[PDB]
Amino acid sequence: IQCSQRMLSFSDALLSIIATVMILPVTHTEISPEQQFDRSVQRLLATRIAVYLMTFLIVTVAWAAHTRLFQVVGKTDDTLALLNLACMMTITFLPYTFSLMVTFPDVPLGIFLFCVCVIAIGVVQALIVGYAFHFPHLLSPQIQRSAHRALYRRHVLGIVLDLHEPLSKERVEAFSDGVYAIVATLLILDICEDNVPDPKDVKERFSGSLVAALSATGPRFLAYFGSFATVGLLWFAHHSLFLHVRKATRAMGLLNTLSLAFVGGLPLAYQQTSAFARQPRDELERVRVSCTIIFLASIFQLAMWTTALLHQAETLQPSVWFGGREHVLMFAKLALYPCASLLAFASTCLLSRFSVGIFHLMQIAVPCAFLLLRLLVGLALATLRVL
Amino acid sequence: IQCSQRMLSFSDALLSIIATVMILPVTHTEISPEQQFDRSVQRLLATRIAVYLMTFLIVTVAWAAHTRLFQVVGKTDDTLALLNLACMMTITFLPYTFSLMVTFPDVPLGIFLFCVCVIAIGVVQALIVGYAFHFPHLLSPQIQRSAHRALYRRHVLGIVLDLHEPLSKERVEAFSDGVYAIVATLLILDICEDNVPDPKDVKERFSGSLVAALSATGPRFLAYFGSFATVGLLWFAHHSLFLHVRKATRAMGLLNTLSLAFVGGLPLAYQQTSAFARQPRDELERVRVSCTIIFLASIFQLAMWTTALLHQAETLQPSVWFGGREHVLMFAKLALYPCASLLAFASTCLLSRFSVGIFHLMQIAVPCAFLLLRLLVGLALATLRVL
Amino acid sequence: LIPIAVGGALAGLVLIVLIAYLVGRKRS
Amino acid sequence: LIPIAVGGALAGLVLIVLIAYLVGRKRS
Lengths: 387, 387, 28, 28
Description:
The complex is a heterotetramer, with 2 copies of chain A and 2 copies of chain C.
Chain A: H1 5-20, H2 23-27, H3 38-72, H4 78-91, H5 94-103, H6 108-134, H7 141-145, H8 149-160, E1 166-167, H9 169-184, H10 186-194, H11 199-205, H12 210-243, E2 248-249, H13 250-263, H14 266-274, H15 283-309, H16 312-315, H17 327-350, H18 355-371, H19 373-386
Antiparallel strand pairs in A: 1-2
Helix pairs in contact in A: 1-3, 1-4, 1-9, 3-5, 4-6, 5-6, 6-8, 9-12, 9-13, 10-12, 12-14, 12-15, 12-17, 13-15, 14-15, 15-17, 17-18
Chain C: H1 2-27
PDB class: membrane protein
Keywords: Complex, membrane protein
Assembly: tetrameric
């Protein structure tokens, strides 16, 4: 018997990696389909993106089940820790099994394997629940303290084999941190992994000028800089939001999951945007994709905050309630990215020929706006105080 | 002003990924140098391994500096959060810059870039310290509460520009969790990424038999299973150890860093071991490498625990002190892997022809020993307590 | 065409978010 | 040869760990 907080943190660290495993193929795709190979490369990329989204949602469902499981339970020991490790091992196969099933939907073997993996996860979770209930001290204080323990003996056991449901705020934060950390550094792993100039390559195709090779690699560095900045600032908005949240309802969990699923695409968006256009006309499409992905990433954080405001009395700290001290600041912080991305996207059509410039200007303005947001909001409130 | 715990957790999540970035090239190496191409492939692999170890140690030094920096500082706000994000962005270039320098030691550009990156990290940390001190409420309660604040104004600022030093236990746990989670799932990312059978490949080289294609990948699945089991059980030993630690001295931090650096190699060890030997003599080397890597990974956890016992009065909880209730159990839990790996390694020389069988038996037995360790220790202490 | 379509979809998303904001405001 | 050398190195490592254990025991 001991505190289970750390093993849950490790479980979230594993679940973030497993959920975001499937973006690696997407970012390793053929970014430059020269000779107009788009006709097939884009179909392949769409298949990979669909697989990534589906696997992320499935693994997030598994994580939700896991957090509820270790929310009826409230303690740990060697046996529970090892059972949780086994459950985590059985969850890591969901991405591969689902990808195999999607690749071979006709062959029954893929679906059989996916069903076997799901049944295994359920079996290990049922084992965890049974072990926890056989030793009553391991349950959460309420479950063991309550004389209604007999019905709880069946409730979640049946569940393993709704928008007001309180999720674990700490575990939502941990999973979000893991996903943001993975996504922000997603495409520096690529640069470190394969983008170190080989001595022979610089000698032959650059005449021995290392700076020429570094310049050739430059675009990937620009992509990484933009992607890290965007994802880190989205995480900053997320962190500011959850600092003022007292409870996380399942609606907030769903909106957070959508936000993370759409955040996962930012590395691809910036990687495409830095692969400068052979025909500048499609740079408009690249910028549109980047802006729409950023908006989808951030608008769901804003939607989560508003869904929380719907019950702020019980869900949000007083500092952020309607008319609170930091309500206006919170709204500005959460809506800074949606508004900027939407304005840039509109510029892609109404002011198309300057769209790349406006997008690169937004990438520089939004960080400064976040840095100066307190002062800007103070100025805005002073202006709309006499006027 | 608010609690900085979550931003530190995100910093640790980033630092774990950055520290373990360099193992990806190592595990993506040419595992099967057929025709005895070892003469060059092993030189390449050794170069990659040396680069990985050096980058891990450098990034761990950066993480140590970061944790002391946000140990003198004890608050967060928008400005500090954004400065920390900038510092993290500047730290993510240490692996790439160091690899570039090592690849081109003669060319001054690589060393210049590495020095620029280090200076940038130092500059951002100095900015964080200056901002924190200009607003004294952001410092830790002790530093701001102290009347000698003027000396601390200079101490850590000079540091940014000892074996008894208390490290942050929470952040050591967070970094360890990140590294263990990354390493355990390291070689399932590759399986998902490029090991899903293509429809045409099964059609041509397997006549349309998907089961044959899956059997072809079988060895890598066994490698993943073994690697996840070993790394998860090492994490379980780590988690049990730190559940009973009250303070983490810098000696414990150093030993933990060595343990993690050697844990990072387990995926490669199991990947080589599962690539069954083309001759009986070759499997012995793979088994020896696996056993020595496992021993190096776990013996440093044991060494950390003993270094803690050296000051148990102030460093370890009473339940683990000499003669404590769980002291024997803690020793058994920490020494289970060192002893098992050492015996399996000795079996490679004294009982060589059965070495692979003994190694697989160790893989099957160590998990069971951990699961039953409480009962076995109870039986042993009942036996050698009357007899 | 399609750029304006997805722009309208995004405008609808922000509009529904604002509607939720105002519903919360009145519920306060 | 080298397998015995690294085995001896590992034996030395476990020996030094045990020495630290005993030093802590006496210091208790």
